[PDB]
Design a protein around this ligand. Structure first.
Ligand SMILES: [Zn+2]
Ligand SMILES: [Zn+2]
Length: 53
DNA sequence: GCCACCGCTGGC
DNA sequence: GCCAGCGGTGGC
C-alpha cells in the first residue's frame, strides 16, 4: 500500500497498544475519534508520515 | 512547513 | 451503511 511496506514490525502488528495518542483517540478505547490515525506502533517504519511514528 | 483535525471512501 | 485510516488543509 501507499503508507504500508507490509514487511516491517509495524506493518505486521495486529494489536493496538491502547496507550499512545492515536489509540486513546479511538472509539474502542473511549476516545472521540477526532484524530483518526493508526496506533503509533502500527505506523509503517518505511512509509508512514515521519511525525506518526 | 507542521499538525491537529476532518472529509472521504474502499473494503467489508 | 459502517468504519479504518488515508490525504488535504486551516490556522498557527
Ligand atoms: Zn497505540
Ligand atoms: Zn512497513
Amino acid at each position: 500500500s501507499a503508507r504500508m511496506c507490509g514487511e516491517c514490525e509495524a506493518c505486521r502488528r495486529t494489536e493496538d497498544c491502547g496507550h499512545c495518542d492515536f489509540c486513546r483517540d479511538m472509539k474502542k478505547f473511549g476516545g472521540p475519534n477526532k484524530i483518526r490515525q493508526k496506533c503509533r506502533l502500527r505506523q509503517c517504519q518505511l512509509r508512514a508520515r515521519e511525525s506518526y511514528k
